[PDB]
PDB file of C-alpha atoms and ligand atoms in Angstrom:
ATOM      1  CA  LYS A   1       1.292 -17.055  14.239  1.00 28.27           C
ATOM      2  CA  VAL A   2       3.454 -14.001  14.977  1.00 25.71           C
ATOM      3  CA  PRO A   3       1.290 -10.807  14.580  1.00 24.85           C
ATOM      4  CA  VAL A   4       2.305  -8.607  11.611  1.00 23.29           C
ATOM      5  CA  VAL A   5       1.889  -4.944  12.462  1.00 20.79           C
ATOM      6  CA  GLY A   6       2.270  -1.909  10.204  1.00 22.54           C
ATOM      7  CA  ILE A   7       3.492   1.095  12.086  1.00 22.66           C
ATOM      8  CA  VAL A   8       3.501   4.510  10.484  1.00 19.85           C
ATOM      9  CA  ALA A   9       3.190   8.230  11.226  1.00 19.25           C
ATOM     10  CA  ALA A  10       0.821   9.942   8.769  1.00 19.39           C
ATOM     11  CA  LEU A  11      -0.385  13.580   8.262  1.00 20.56           C
ATOM     12  CA  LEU A  12      -4.138  14.029   7.805  1.00 19.75           C
ATOM     13  CA  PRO A  13      -6.171  14.318   5.712  1.00 20.36           C
ATOM     14  CA  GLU A  14      -4.142  12.812   2.813  1.00 21.99           C
ATOM     15  CA  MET A  15      -1.970  10.599   5.091  1.00 20.84           C
ATOM     16  CA  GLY A  16       1.337  11.910   3.823  1.00 18.19           C
ATOM     17  CA  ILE A  17       4.343  10.119   5.362  1.00 13.02           C
ATOM     18  CA  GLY A  18       7.410  11.369   3.430  1.00 11.28           C
ATOM     19  CA  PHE A  19       9.074  14.067   1.262  1.00  8.80           C
ATOM     20  CA  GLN A  20      12.265  13.692  -0.788  1.00  8.84           C
ATOM     21  CA  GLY A  21      13.473  10.541   1.017  1.00  6.09           C
ATOM     22  CA  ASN A  22      12.803  11.832   4.558  1.00  8.89           C
ATOM     23  CA  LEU A  23      10.076  12.410   7.151  1.00 11.88           C
ATOM     24  CA  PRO A  24       8.227  15.762   6.650  1.00 13.56           C
ATOM     25  CA  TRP A  25       8.498  16.550  10.372  1.00 12.15           C
ATOM     26  CA  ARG A  26      10.862  15.879  13.275  1.00 14.29           C
ATOM     27  CA  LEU A  27       8.893  14.962  16.384  1.00 12.81           C
ATOM     28  CA  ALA A  28      10.946  13.524  19.225  1.00 12.68           C
ATOM     29  CA  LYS A  29       7.935  12.190  21.075  1.00 11.47           C
ATOM     30  CA  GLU A  30       6.638  10.347  18.062  1.00 10.70           C
ATOM     31  CA  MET A  31      10.119   8.831  17.467  1.00  7.03           C
ATOM     32  CA  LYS A  32      10.018   7.797  21.142  1.00  8.04           C
ATOM     33  CA  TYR A  33       6.669   6.031  20.733  1.00  7.56           C
ATOM     34  CA  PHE A  34       7.935   4.247  17.595  1.00  7.33           C
ATOM     35  CA  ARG A  35      11.214   3.294  19.320  1.00  8.06           C
ATOM     36  CA  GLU A  36       9.500   1.982  22.422  1.00  5.83           C
ATOM     37  CA  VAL A  37       6.665   0.107  20.683  1.00  7.16           C
ATOM     38  CA  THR A  38       8.977  -1.681  18.220  1.00  5.76           C
ATOM     39  CA  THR A  39      11.691  -2.379  20.847  1.00  4.77           C
ATOM     40  CA  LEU A  40       9.731  -3.444  23.891  1.00  4.67           C
ATOM     41  CA  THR A  41       8.225  -6.895  24.369  1.00  4.72           C
ATOM     42  CA  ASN A  42       5.941  -8.500  26.928  1.00  4.02           C
ATOM     43  CA  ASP A  43       8.188 -11.564  26.934  1.00  5.21           C
ATOM     44  CA  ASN A  44      11.746 -10.551  27.996  1.00  3.31           C
ATOM     45  CA  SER A  45      13.345 -13.440  26.067  1.00  6.78           C
ATOM     46  CA  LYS A  46      11.870 -12.365  22.721  1.00  4.55           C
ATOM     47  CA  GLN A  47      12.719  -9.567  20.271  1.00  7.23           C
ATOM     48  CA  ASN A  48      10.633  -7.913  17.592  1.00  4.72           C
ATOM     49  CA  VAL A  49      11.484  -7.809  13.946  1.00  5.99           C
ATOM     50  CA  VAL A  50      11.453  -4.558  11.950  1.00  5.34           C
ATOM     51  CA  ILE A  51      11.132  -4.831   8.189  1.00  7.80           C
ATOM     52  CA  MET A  52      11.844  -1.915   5.839  1.00  8.66           C
ATOM     53  CA  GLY A  53      12.375  -1.095   2.180  1.00  9.20           C
ATOM     54  CA  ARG A  54      15.920  -0.360   0.975  1.00  8.70           C
ATOM     55  CA  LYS A  55      15.169   3.328   0.531  1.00 10.69           C
ATOM     56  CA  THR A  56      13.975   3.685   4.102  1.00 13.41           C
ATOM     57  CA  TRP A  57      17.093   1.880   5.364  1.00 11.57           C
ATOM     58  CA  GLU A  58      19.187   4.422   3.481  1.00 16.08           C
ATOM     59  CA  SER A  59      17.301   7.297   5.105  1.00 16.98           C
ATOM     60  CA  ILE A  60      18.338   6.283   8.629  1.00 15.83           C
ATOM     61  CA  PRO A  61      21.473   8.093   9.897  1.00 15.06           C
ATOM     62  CA  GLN A  62      24.462   5.744   9.809  1.00 20.98           C
ATOM     63  CA  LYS A  63      24.915   6.067  13.583  1.00 18.58           C
ATOM     64  CA  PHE A  64      21.403   4.889  14.339  1.00 22.46           C
ATOM     65  CA  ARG A  65      21.238   1.782  12.134  1.00 21.82           C
ATOM     66  CA  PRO A  66      20.659  -1.039  12.461  1.00 16.36           C
ATOM     67  CA  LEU A  67      17.913  -0.137  14.964  1.00 16.96           C
ATOM     68  CA  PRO A  68      19.162  -1.490  18.347  1.00 16.75           C
ATOM     69  CA  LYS A  69      17.530  -4.483  20.072  1.00 21.85           C
ATOM     70  CA  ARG A  70      15.294  -5.423  17.140  1.00 22.54           C
ATOM     71  CA  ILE A  71      16.021  -7.806  14.279  1.00 23.03           C
ATOM     72  CA  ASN A  72      16.435  -5.586  11.193  1.00 25.21           C
ATOM     73  CA  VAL A  73      15.324  -6.840   7.818  1.00 26.99           C
ATOM     74  CA  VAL A  74      16.027  -4.750   4.701  1.00 26.43           C
ATOM     75  CA  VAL A  75      14.266  -5.680   1.432  1.00 23.41           C
ATOM     76  CA  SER A  76      15.685  -5.045  -2.020  1.00 23.72           C
ATOM     77  CA  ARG A  77      14.998  -6.812  -5.298  1.00 26.21           C
ATOM     78  CA  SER A  78      18.816  -6.932  -5.862  1.00 26.75           C
ATOM     79  CA  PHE A  79      19.473  -8.956  -2.704  1.00 21.97           C
ATOM     80  CA  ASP A  80      20.160 -12.663  -2.940  1.00 24.50           C
ATOM     81  CA  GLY A  81      17.579 -14.811  -1.143  1.00 26.27           C
ATOM     82  CA  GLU A  82      14.432 -14.755   0.954  1.00 28.17           C
ATOM     83  CA  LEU A  83      16.144 -14.160   4.271  1.00 31.39           C
ATOM     84  CA  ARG A  84      19.895 -13.964   4.749  1.00 34.43           C
ATOM     85  CA  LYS A  85      22.060 -12.658   7.603  1.00 35.99           C
ATOM     86  CA  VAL A  86      24.564 -10.160   6.263  1.00 38.33           C
ATOM     87  CA  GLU A  87      25.768  -8.629   9.568  1.00 37.71           C
ATOM     88  CA  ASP A  88      25.031  -8.530  13.266  1.00 38.25           C
ATOM     89  CA  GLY A  89      21.401  -7.387  13.599  1.00 41.63           C
ATOM     90  CA  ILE A  90      20.930  -7.194   9.820  1.00 42.69           C
ATOM     91  CA  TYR A  91      19.082  -9.552   7.451  1.00 42.61           C
ATOM     92  CA  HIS A  92      18.708  -9.013   3.747  1.00 36.72           C
ATOM     93  CA  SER A  93      15.709 -10.212   1.765  1.00 36.49           C
ATOM     94  CA  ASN A  94      14.793  -9.941  -1.887  1.00 39.41           C
ATOM     95  CA  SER A  95      11.062 -10.351  -1.196  1.00 38.94           C
ATOM     96  CA  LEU A  96       8.725  -8.813   1.389  1.00 39.99           C
ATOM     97  CA  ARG A  97       6.284 -11.763   1.165  1.00 38.55           C
ATOM     98  CA  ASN A  98       8.884 -14.578   1.310  1.00 37.03           C
ATOM     99  CA  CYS A  99      10.809 -12.960   4.140  1.00 38.39           C
ATOM    100  CA  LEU A 100       7.514 -12.835   6.132  1.00 40.18           C
ATOM    101  CA  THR A 101       6.962 -16.545   5.433  1.00 41.51           C
ATOM    102  CA  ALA A 102      10.550 -17.212   6.510  1.00 39.96           C
ATOM    103  CA  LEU A 103      10.171 -15.178   9.746  1.00 38.93           C
ATOM    104  CA  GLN A 104       7.009 -17.154  10.651  1.00 35.51           C
ATOM    105  CA  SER A 105       8.784 -20.561  10.650  1.00 33.69           C
ATOM    106  CA  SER A 106       8.885 -21.552  14.291  1.00 35.47           C
ATOM    107  CA  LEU A 107      11.789 -23.840  13.370  1.00 34.32           C
ATOM    108  CA  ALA A 108      13.849 -20.858  12.160  1.00 35.34           C
ATOM    109  CA  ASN A 109      12.641 -18.385  14.812  1.00 36.25           C
ATOM    110  CA  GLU A 110      12.390 -20.751  17.803  1.00 37.85           C
ATOM    111  CA  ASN A 111       9.256 -18.885  18.884  1.00 41.18           C
ATOM    112  CA  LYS A 112      11.576 -16.099  20.046  1.00 42.36           C
ATOM    113  CA  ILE A 113      10.038 -13.381  17.862  1.00 42.72           C
ATOM    114  CA  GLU A 114       7.109 -11.656  19.531  1.00 43.65           C
ATOM    115  CA  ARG A 115       5.962  -9.303  16.710  1.00 41.79           C
ATOM    116  CA  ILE A 116       6.839  -8.401  13.181  1.00 39.83           C
ATOM    117  CA  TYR A 117       6.706  -4.649  12.578  1.00 36.76           C
ATOM    118  CA  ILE A 118       6.622  -3.264   9.056  1.00 39.10           C
ATOM    119  CA  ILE A 119       8.237   0.149   9.488  1.00 41.52           C
ATOM    120  CA  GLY A 120       7.944   1.457   6.007  1.00 42.51           C
ATOM    121  CA  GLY A 121       8.646   2.498   2.683  1.00 45.30           C
ATOM    122  CA  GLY A 122       5.628   4.049   0.950  1.00 47.48           C
ATOM    123  CA  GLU A 123       6.190   1.217  -1.531  1.00 48.99           C
ATOM    124  CA  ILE A 124       6.557  -1.353   1.278  1.00 45.68           C
ATOM    125  CA  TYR A 125       3.344  -0.042   2.981  1.00 46.09           C
ATOM    126  CA  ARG A 126       1.442  -0.363  -0.326  1.00 50.03           C
ATOM    127  CA  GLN A 127       2.184  -4.080  -0.389  1.00 51.52           C
ATOM    128  CA  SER A 128       1.452  -4.658   3.313  1.00 48.05           C
ATOM    129  CA  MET A 129      -2.247  -3.896   3.355  1.00 49.00           C
ATOM    130  CA  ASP A 130      -2.899  -7.584   2.616  1.00 49.13           C
ATOM    131  CA  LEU A 131      -0.102  -8.780   4.868  1.00 49.12           C
ATOM    132  CA  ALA A 132      -0.614  -6.874   8.117  1.00 48.91           C
ATOM    133  CA  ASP A 133      -2.913  -7.998  10.925  1.00 47.03           C
ATOM    134  CA  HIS A 134      -3.059  -4.487  12.466  1.00 47.27           C
ATOM    135  CA  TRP A 135      -1.836  -0.943  11.787  1.00 42.65           C
ATOM    136  CA  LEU A 136      -0.417   1.429  14.427  1.00 45.80           C
ATOM    137  CA  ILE A 137      -0.964   4.810  12.789  1.00 43.77           C
ATOM    138  CA  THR A 138       0.038   8.051  14.328  1.00 44.38           C
ATOM    139  CA  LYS A 139      -2.457  10.500  12.833  1.00 45.68           C
ATOM    140  CA  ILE A 140      -0.801  13.908  12.700  1.00 46.24           C
ATOM    141  CA  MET A 141      -2.543  17.260  12.194  1.00 45.05           C
ATOM    142  CA  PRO A 142      -0.987  20.660  11.841  1.00 48.54           C
ATOM    143  CA  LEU A 143      -2.238  23.046  14.531  1.00 47.34           C
ATOM    144  CA  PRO A 144      -4.113  26.208  13.416  1.00 47.90           C
ATOM    145  CA  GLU A 145      -1.052  28.422  12.764  1.00 45.23           C
ATOM    146  CA  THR A 146       1.167  25.612  11.443  1.00 45.63           C
ATOM    147  CA  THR A 147       2.245  25.439   7.823  1.00 42.70           C
ATOM    148  CA  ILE A 148       1.279  22.132   6.206  1.00 45.75           C
ATOM    149  CA  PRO A 149       4.595  20.567   5.132  1.00 47.12           C
ATOM    150  CA  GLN A 150       5.155  19.474   1.534  1.00 44.71           C
ATOM    151  CA  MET A 151       4.809  15.684   0.976  1.00 43.49           C
ATOM    152  CA  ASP A 152       5.386  13.248  -1.915  1.00 42.91           C
ATOM    153  CA  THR A 153       4.628   9.835  -0.410  1.00 42.33           C
ATOM    154  CA  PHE A 154       1.322   8.729   1.115  1.00 42.14           C
ATOM    155  CA  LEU A 155      -0.333   5.862   2.989  1.00 38.84           C
ATOM    156  CA  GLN A 156      -3.131   4.199   0.994  1.00 36.08           C
ATOM    157  CA  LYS A 157      -6.100   5.398   3.067  1.00 37.64           C
ATOM    158  CA  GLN A 158      -8.699   3.834   0.733  1.00 34.53           C
ATOM    159  CA  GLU A 159      -7.178   0.349   1.091  1.00 33.84           C
ATOM    160  CA  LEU A 160      -6.742   0.799   4.834  1.00 35.90           C
ATOM    161  CA  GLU A 161     -10.407   1.665   5.360  1.00 38.44           C
ATOM    162  CA  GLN A 162     -11.524  -1.209   3.098  1.00 41.24           C
ATOM    163  CA  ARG A 163      -9.696  -3.844   5.126  1.00 41.01           C
ATOM    164  CA  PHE A 164      -9.354  -2.411   8.634  1.00 39.42           C
ATOM    165  CA  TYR A 165     -11.470  -0.599  11.206  1.00 41.30           C
ATOM    166  CA  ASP A 166     -10.460   1.917  13.878  1.00 38.89           C
ATOM    167  CA  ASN A 167      -9.759  -0.300  16.921  1.00 37.34           C
ATOM    168  CA  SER A 168      -8.224   2.527  18.892  1.00 36.22           C
ATOM    169  CA  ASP A 169     -10.394   1.629  21.932  1.00 36.57           C
ATOM    170  CA  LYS A 170      -7.995  -1.225  22.318  1.00 34.62           C
ATOM    171  CA  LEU A 171      -4.793   0.678  21.651  1.00 33.43           C
ATOM    172  CA  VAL A 172      -3.666   0.685  25.308  1.00 34.07           C
ATOM    173  CA  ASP A 173      -4.110  -3.013  25.772  1.00 34.12           C
ATOM    174  CA  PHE A 174      -2.473  -3.771  22.467  1.00 32.31           C
ATOM    175  CA  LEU A 175       0.770  -2.000  23.289  1.00 31.67           C
ATOM    176  CA  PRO A 176       3.625  -3.772  25.073  1.00 30.40           C
ATOM    177  CA  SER A 177       2.716  -3.760  28.720  1.00 30.43           C
ATOM    178  CA  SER A 178       5.494  -1.581  30.082  1.00 30.47           C
ATOM    179  CA  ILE A 179       4.828   1.540  27.987  1.00 31.99           C
ATOM    180  CA  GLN A 180       3.120   4.518  29.615  1.00 32.78           C
ATOM    181  CA  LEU A 181       1.425   7.197  27.562  1.00 33.18           C
ATOM    182  CA  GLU A 182       0.581  10.772  28.536  1.00 32.83           C
ATOM    183  CA  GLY A 183      -2.880  11.041  26.963  1.00 31.73           C
ATOM    184  CA  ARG A 184      -6.279   9.560  27.711  1.00 33.36           C
ATOM    185  CA  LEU A 185      -8.419   8.140  24.875  1.00 34.56           C
ATOM    186  CA  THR A 186     -10.125  11.031  23.045  1.00 36.72           C
ATOM    187  CA  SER A 187     -12.450  11.406  20.020  1.00 37.16           C
ATOM    188  CA  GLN A 188     -12.020  14.671  18.142  1.00 39.57           C
ATOM    189  CA  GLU A 189     -13.435  15.977  14.918  1.00 42.78           C
ATOM    190  CA  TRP A 190     -10.927  17.238  12.398  1.00 37.58           C
ATOM    191  CA  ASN A 191     -11.812  18.509   8.966  1.00 39.22           C
ATOM    192  CA  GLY A 192     -14.885  16.360   8.813  1.00 36.97           C
ATOM    193  CA  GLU A 193     -13.298  13.083   9.960  1.00 37.43           C
ATOM    194  CA  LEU A 194     -13.382  11.276  13.330  1.00 37.16           C
ATOM    195  CA  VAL A 195      -9.960  11.115  14.983  1.00 34.16           C
ATOM    196  CA  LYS A 196      -9.699   8.790  17.961  1.00 36.16           C
ATOM    197  CA  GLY A 197      -6.636   7.668  19.968  1.00 38.21           C
ATOM    198  CA  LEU A 198      -4.073   8.942  22.488  1.00 38.46           C
ATOM    199  CA  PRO A 199      -3.262  12.648  22.080  1.00 41.38           C
ATOM    200  CA  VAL A 200       0.110  14.395  22.057  1.00 42.00           C
ATOM    201  CA  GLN A 201       1.223  17.852  20.939  1.00 46.16           C
ATOM    202  CA  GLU A 202       4.740  18.799  19.927  1.00 48.81           C
ATOM    203  CA  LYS A 203       6.010  21.726  17.890  1.00 48.29           C
ATOM    204  CA  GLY A 204       3.294  22.869  15.482  1.00 47.37           C
ATOM    205  CA  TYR A 205       1.509  19.527  15.517  1.00 46.81           C
ATOM    206  CA  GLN A 206      -1.195  17.653  17.293  1.00 51.03           C
ATOM    207  CA  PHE A 207      -1.058  13.843  16.937  1.00 49.72           C
ATOM    208  CA  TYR A 208      -2.983  10.720  17.959  1.00 48.89           C
ATOM    209  CA  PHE A 209      -1.694   7.189  18.435  1.00 49.76           C
ATOM    210  CA  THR A 210      -4.378   4.935  16.959  1.00 53.02           C
ATOM    211  CA  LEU A 211      -4.816   1.218  16.234  1.00 50.10           C
ATOM    212  CA  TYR A 212      -6.507  -0.330  13.182  1.00 47.62           C
ATOM    213  CA  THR A 213      -7.476  -3.996  13.027  1.00 51.12           C
ATOM    214  CA  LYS A 214      -8.654  -6.321  10.224  1.00 51.84           C
ATOM    215  CA  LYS A 215     -12.429  -6.262   9.697  1.00 48.08           C
ATOM    216  CA  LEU A 216     -14.354  -9.447  10.321  1.00 47.56           C
ATOM    217  CA  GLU A 217     -14.264 -11.776   7.319  1.00 50.95           C
ATOM    218  CA  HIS A 218     -16.943 -14.102   5.971  1.00 53.06           C
ATOM    219  CA  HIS A 219     -16.186 -17.820   5.757  1.00 51.25           C
ATOM    220  CA  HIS A 220     -16.216 -18.562   2.013  1.00 48.76           C
ATOM    221  CA  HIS A 221     -13.724 -21.447   1.823  1.00 47.77           C
ATOM    222  CA  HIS A 222     -11.345 -23.435   4.073  1.00 50.61           C
ATOM    223  CA  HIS A 223      -8.812 -25.688   2.284  1.00 52.41           C
ATOM    224  CA  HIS A 224      -9.366 -29.444   2.876  1.00 52.60           C
ATOM    225  CA  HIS A 225      -7.228 -32.390   1.700  1.00 50.62           C
TER     226      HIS A 225
HETATM  227  N1  NDP B 301       6.097   8.505   8.180  1.00 45.14           N
HETATM  228  C1  NDP B 301       6.574   7.283   8.417  1.00 45.14           C
HETATM  229  O1  NDP B 301       6.174   6.533   9.529  1.00 45.14           O
HETATM  230  C2  NDP B 301       7.588   6.706   7.509  1.00 45.14           C
HETATM  231  C3  NDP B 301       7.875   7.340   6.316  1.00 45.14           C
HETATM  232  N2  NDP B 301       8.786   6.808   5.457  1.00 45.14           N
HETATM  233  C4  NDP B 301       9.099   7.535   4.222  1.00 45.14           C
HETATM  234  O2  NDP B 301       8.886   6.785   3.054  1.00 45.14           O
HETATM  235  C5  NDP B 301       9.757   7.244   2.023  1.00 45.14           C
HETATM  236  C6  NDP B 301      10.465   6.059   1.391  1.00 45.14           C
HETATM  237  O3  NDP B 301       9.483   5.243   0.795  1.00 45.14           O
HETATM  238  P1  NDP B 301       9.694   4.689  -0.689  1.00 45.14           P
HETATM  239  O4  NDP B 301      10.410   5.756  -1.408  1.00 45.14           O
HETATM  240  O5  NDP B 301       8.421   4.134  -1.187  1.00 45.14           O
HETATM  241  O6  NDP B 301      10.716   3.489  -0.449  1.00 45.14           O
HETATM  242  P2  NDP B 301      10.649   2.163   0.465  1.00 45.14           P
HETATM  243  O7  NDP B 301      11.185   2.396   1.822  1.00 45.14           O
HETATM  244  O8  NDP B 301       9.307   1.544   0.464  1.00 45.14           O
HETATM  245  O9  NDP B 301      11.631   1.193  -0.355  1.00 45.14           O
HETATM  246  C7  NDP B 301      11.431   1.009  -1.743  1.00 45.14           C
HETATM  247  C8  NDP B 301      12.425  -0.069  -2.178  1.00 45.14           C
HETATM  248  O10 NDP B 301      12.248  -1.266  -1.428  1.00 45.14           O
HETATM  249  C9  NDP B 301      12.518  -2.400  -2.236  1.00 45.14           C
HETATM  250  N3  NDP B 301      11.315  -3.215  -2.354  1.00 45.14           N
HETATM  251  C10 NDP B 301      10.043  -2.757  -2.514  1.00 45.14           C
HETATM  252  N4  NDP B 301       9.214  -3.825  -2.544  1.00 45.14           N
HETATM  253  C11 NDP B 301       9.956  -4.953  -2.393  1.00 45.14           C
HETATM  254  C12 NDP B 301       9.628  -6.308  -2.381  1.00 45.14           C
HETATM  255  N5  NDP B 301       8.358  -6.706  -2.494  1.00 45.14           N
HETATM  256  N6  NDP B 301      10.625  -7.250  -2.248  1.00 45.14           N
HETATM  257  C13 NDP B 301      11.941  -6.851  -2.153  1.00 45.14           C
HETATM  258  N7  NDP B 301      12.255  -5.496  -2.194  1.00 45.14           N
HETATM  259  C14 NDP B 301      11.278  -4.570  -2.305  1.00 45.14           C
HETATM  260  C15 NDP B 301      12.935  -1.875  -3.597  1.00 45.14           C
HETATM  261  O11 NDP B 301      14.312  -1.755  -3.428  1.00 45.14           O
HETATM  262  P3  NDP B 301      15.378  -1.835  -4.618  1.00 45.14           P
HETATM  263  O12 NDP B 301      15.178  -0.581  -5.432  1.00 45.14           O
HETATM  264  O13 NDP B 301      16.769  -1.859  -4.025  1.00 45.14           O
HETATM  265  O14 NDP B 301      15.203  -3.134  -5.343  1.00 45.14           O
HETATM  266  C16 NDP B 301      12.309  -0.491  -3.638  1.00 45.14           C
HETATM  267  O15 NDP B 301      13.010   0.410  -4.481  1.00 45.14           O
HETATM  268  C17 NDP B 301      10.729   8.202   2.671  1.00 45.14           C
HETATM  269  O16 NDP B 301      10.274   9.526   2.406  1.00 45.14           O
HETATM  270  C18 NDP B 301      10.546   7.946   4.151  1.00 45.14           C
HETATM  271  O17 NDP B 301      10.788   9.112   4.933  1.00 45.14           O
HETATM  272  C19 NDP B 301       9.455   5.639   5.780  1.00 45.14           C
HETATM  273  C20 NDP B 301       9.160   4.967   6.962  1.00 45.14           C
HETATM  274  C21 NDP B 301       8.245   5.516   7.861  1.00 45.14           C
HETATM  275  C1  QLR B 302      12.872   3.546   9.997  1.00 45.56           C
HETATM  276  C2  QLR B 302      12.302   4.697   9.175  1.00 45.56           C
HETATM  277  C3  QLR B 302      11.980   5.960   9.991  1.00 45.56           C
HETATM  278  C4  QLR B 302      10.700   5.807  10.708  1.00 45.56           C
HETATM  279  C5  QLR B 302       9.612   5.729  11.265  1.00 45.56           C
HETATM  280  C6  QLR B 302       8.348   5.718  11.932  1.00 45.56           C
HETATM  281  C7  QLR B 302       8.077   6.741  12.839  1.00 45.56           C
HETATM  282  C8  QLR B 302       9.126   7.855  13.098  1.00 45.56           C
HETATM  283  N1  QLR B 302       6.906   6.738  13.514  1.00 45.56           N
HETATM  284  C9  QLR B 302       5.995   5.780  13.307  1.00 45.56           C
HETATM  285  N2  QLR B 302       4.854   5.819  14.005  1.00 45.56           N
HETATM  286  N3  QLR B 302       6.226   4.780  12.418  1.00 45.56           N
HETATM  287  C10 QLR B 302       7.399   4.692  11.753  1.00 45.56           C
HETATM  288  N4  QLR B 302       7.611   3.685  10.887  1.00 45.56           N
HETATM  289  C11 QLR B 302      13.177   6.477  10.816  1.00 45.56           C
HETATM  290  C12 QLR B 302      14.010   7.443  10.242  1.00 45.56           C
HETATM  291  C13 QLR B 302      15.130   7.925  10.936  1.00 45.56           C
HETATM  292  O1  QLR B 302      15.958   8.871  10.357  1.00 45.56           O
HETATM  293  C14 QLR B 302      15.332  10.151  10.156  1.00 45.56           C
HETATM  294  C15 QLR B 302      15.425   7.402  12.201  1.00 45.56           C
HETATM  295  O2  QLR B 302      16.537   7.816  12.888  1.00 45.56           O
HETATM  296  C16 QLR B 302      16.267   8.950  13.765  1.00 45.56           C
HETATM  297  C17 QLR B 302      14.589   6.433  12.777  1.00 45.56           C
HETATM  298  O3  QLR B 302      14.916   5.905  14.012  1.00 45.56           O
HETATM  299  C18 QLR B 302      13.870   6.033  15.005  1.00 45.56           C
HETATM  300  C19 QLR B 302      13.476   5.958  12.070  1.00 45.56           C
END
């Protein structure tokens, strides 16, 4: 009953997200968006959860982790159980799926979690296409004179577009209420695809905050007792 939201910054057209254990760009304004969206809540007495693969945890500078003011969950197959507190602000889980089931228990969470953000791993993102209710995708494009950065990790665009549609018309309303953006909603063509969302430019890059939402589903079966 808590929304599960993938949040990722991806370079078009291949949707590259990483290179050699790190982000392929350093964009302060995109960091800011990610920080604000995952931190802020509409209900002041709730926090969000952020879930991340082990390798992504290890990529965060020691100073900056665990991410302040959000419940941090790190998943590793070598960890001990489905959701276990190991330190202030840090939970360990040995299973993405079971930790999500554990976070959803209103007995455990007291209805004091507002959203669950999946904040990456390429490998984590691969397994979240079936788990996430929405995706917040920052679609990044190199500007004309900008060198395309090398990349070795990618968002699964095929599986995204199978399950989700571009709901970016509703991006503004979706975001926690107290965030202000600099763009207006814009639809732009870029290398033969439609890019729609809230525009920013920084360094050699143009980027759009977008929202994707699960497509409507037919009613095939509902479990009865
Ligand atoms: N552009 C963006 O918005 C973002 C990009 N990235 C990028 O992604 C890259 C890292 O991704 P990747 O290398 O795929 O690693 P991940 O961050 O996805 O972590 C992979 C590890 O997570 C653990 N794991 C995976 N699935 C599960 C599961 N189902 N249950 C329990 N543990 C699991 C395993 O850990 P173990 O081996 O210990 O068992 C696995 O080795 C980096 O380049 C990073 O910069 C990361 C976040 C955001
Ligand atoms: C936790 C993984 C990654 C991310 C992301 C991420 C970003 C940037 N943007 C979007 N739209 N989605 C994401 N999921 C990240 C790496 C860092 O070290 C280099 C961070 O410290 C500075 C950081 O704190 C902010 C966050």
